[PDB]
């Protein structure tokens, strides 16, 4: 009827809000494009290959960015070099002295300490030194 015709034509001509919201969404898309473009331009490969960076002012980063391969970070400590976590011997002259001190401060017998010192004075090599330390640990803490 007349009401059918009127209430069909009304909406089916005022449909234009769809193209209006499409205008809106394309504006949103073109505005986020430049956002992600700036965030991509801010950084390239870096120790990951992507970690953005910024500074107090614009041009105050040229002292830590190259030494894009920025710098030396924290050095990781494992079970191969000595640190405050545990002791492992090495080739330096301090390891022999600390092993001697462990032997002296142990609770073994005097002739046993002499025997161990005699073995140590001719033990040579990083691997053999580590093996002697690992054996000495058991010997003293048993």
């Amino acid at each position: 009827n007349q009401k059918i015709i009127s209430k069909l034509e009304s909406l089916l001509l005022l449909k234009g809000e769809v193209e209006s919201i499409k205008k809106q969404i394309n504006r949103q898309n073109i505005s986020i494009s430049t956002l992600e473009g700036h965030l991509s331009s801010i950084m390239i490969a870096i120790p990951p290959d992507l970690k953005p960076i910024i500074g107090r002012d614009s041009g105050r980063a040229l002292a830590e960015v190259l030494k894009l391969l920025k710098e030396f970070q924290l050095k990781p400590i494992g079970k191969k070099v000595s640190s405050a976590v545990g002791f492992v011997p090495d080739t330096g002259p301090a390891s022999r002295s600390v092993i001697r001190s462990i032997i002296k401060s142990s609770r073994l017998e005097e002739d046993r300490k002499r025997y161990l010192m005699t073995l140590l004075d001719d033990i040579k090599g990083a691997n053999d030194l580590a093996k002697f330390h690992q054996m000495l640990m058991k010997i003293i803490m048993k």
Binding site: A84, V85, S101, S105
Partner: peptide, 24 residues
């Protein structure tokens, strides 16, 4: 030197290994 009397044997000498290096 007081650390040498520890009970977990892996700890004996940790700080001493640094003091001796610094003295050397």
């Amino acid at each position: 030197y007081l650390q040498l009397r520890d009970i977990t044997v892996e700890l004996r000498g940790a700080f001493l290994n640094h003091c001796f290096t610094e003295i050397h």
